[PDB]
Design a protein around this ligand. Structure first.
Ligand SMILES: *[C@@H]1O[C@H](CO)[C@@H](O)[C@H](O)[C@H]1NC(C)=O
Ligand SMILES: *[C@@H]1O[C@H](CO)[C@@H](O)[C@H](O)[C@H]1NC(C)=O
Ligand SMILES: *[C@@H]1O[C@H](CO)[C@@H](O)[C@H](O)[C@H]1NC(C)=O
Ligand SMILES: *[C@@H]1O[C@H](CO)[C@@H](O)[C@H](O)[C@H]1NC(C)=O
Ligand SMILES: Cn1c(=O)c2[nH]cnc2n(C)c1=O
Ligand SMILES: Cn1c(=O)c2[nH]cnc2n(C)c1=O
Ligand SMILES: Cn1c(=O)c2[nH]cnc2n(C)c1=O
Ligand SMILES: Cn1c(=O)c2[nH]cnc2n(C)c1=O
Lengths: 124, 115, 115, 124
């Protein structure tokens, strides 16, 4: 079977794009995230990301996580998922995310986290 | 200014130490859980520097060294005069078959204070 | 007006039928998954009636009859001209010891269309 | 050991209160939710809830779920968790929730779900 590789340019269901560079032997990678929409009335852009792929047992379809450090807001998003070979033999990232808003008071902390999915496929 | 650097412990008794935060907001650390005895896994993340908030949001990934899983944590560094990290996490399990993907993600909270 | 009453199927191939929605917005139904063959569990929930929106939010609980677990789903009934339910769910597993509570909750999405 | 029972008045970490009535033999219950804060600039109140407790194997510490049908907004929250006897012998509900906002466009669906926890203890 193919190995599923994180390295490449990706697009998701919402029209956002993402690039991920080479993964080092420690499983670390950097990338960029170019977002389609926004929960702010601020314009979007490219924002950097950093994360790791799990290399335990050197699975062909590894789990990974990354953090997006939004450059156009005070928020942070983390993504986590797995690099699968799909039924049709394509690479697919199946991910879920938490979007953390900045709040001014610790008493608003409870409503500062949104959750959802994103499915990435390779954009050539 | 609530800062991520230092030694932390959470509501479950796990420990975490985080190094210096660089100008791009990036930091690395080690996450410590007990089952055997104690396990140590690297973590890497960033804090948000937009508006240079005294109470910044942040994120990090734990690359578990004892399983195939990955966890990401995100939240906000609060300063009352004690510092507290309020976080939520997603724990992604490895599945073999994409048909099992639906059940591979767990979610929860952790609250960290200085150890 | 996007309506919850009827027969639905999701992206995983599970089926769901929901009865009439009463004046308090309450409804009951049956949720159908395949493993054996097919299982049937009751569900109960409400749709939100504030402002009598054409595309209302809603929630429901599935009381699984084949395990000790419970799932809740919440989301919004959209009308494009096809009706689509966009939902997220939490699947709560039973643990024996409160010390295991942290890992008892999974999260995901389901999208339902008319069957 | 005690059985953990849903029936009663409860308070959580945020200061919200909740009542749950008798649970019927089908595991069904009704209740009310009186909330401390809000993600809206609307005032709070009492809102009804309905849900079920799992009775498979008649566990002493059952899982359950319920839906809160907010009367002061277009949103809906679902809660799910387990009724534990804690280390100190008290009943505790350990729950997690999804708060679904109403959006006007299906294209905003992605940011319409927030997530968090709530810990309930009996208020006498
Ligand atoms: C994603 O990449 C495609 C191919 O260049 C580009 O046309 C499209 O507009 C991109 N989407 C965003 C939101 O940048
Ligand atoms: C966490 O912190 C302290 C170290 O001061 C120790 O009591 C405890 O055993 C540690 N737990 C670990 C290493 O998981
Ligand atoms: C769901 O819907 C249709 C019934 O028309 C059927 O093809 C499929 O097998 C059903 N799946 C179940 C019952 O889980
Ligand atoms: C919860 O109940 C207590 C006891 O009556 C009451 O004083 C308190 O204000 C309630 N909290 C809310 C938000 O209603
Ligand atoms: C996950 N996610 C998105 O999918 C998105 N699209 C636009 N902003 C976005 N943000 C901030 C985000 O966190
Ligand atoms: C969040 N979290 C924990 O709190 C934990 N405790 C033990 N393993 C753990 N893992 C893998 C995890 O992701
Ligand atoms: C959401 N969900 C599912 O999609 C599913 N499929 C099979 N069991 C399932 N359970 C228990 C569940 O909660
Ligand atoms: C979970 N939750 C709360 O804890 C809360 N507090 C105030 N509104 C609230 N809402 C709408 C809510 O869904």
């Amino acid at each position: 079977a193919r190995k599923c590789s994180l390295t490449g340019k990706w697009t998701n269901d919402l029209g956002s794009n993402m690039t991920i560079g080479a993964v080092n032997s420690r499983g670390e990678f950097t990338g960029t995230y170019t977002t389609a929409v926004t929960a702010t009335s601020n314009e979007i852009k490219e924002s950097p990301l950093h994360g790791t792929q799990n290399t335990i047992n050197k699975r062909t379809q590894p789990t990974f996580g990354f953090t997006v450090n939004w450059k156009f807001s005070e928020s942070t998003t983390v993504f986590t998922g797995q690099c699968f070979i799909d039924r049709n033999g394509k690479e697919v990232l199946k991910t879920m995310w938490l979007l953390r808003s900045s709040v001014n008071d610790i008493g608003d902390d409870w409503k500062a986290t949104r959750v959802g999915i994103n499915i990435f496929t390779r954009l050539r």
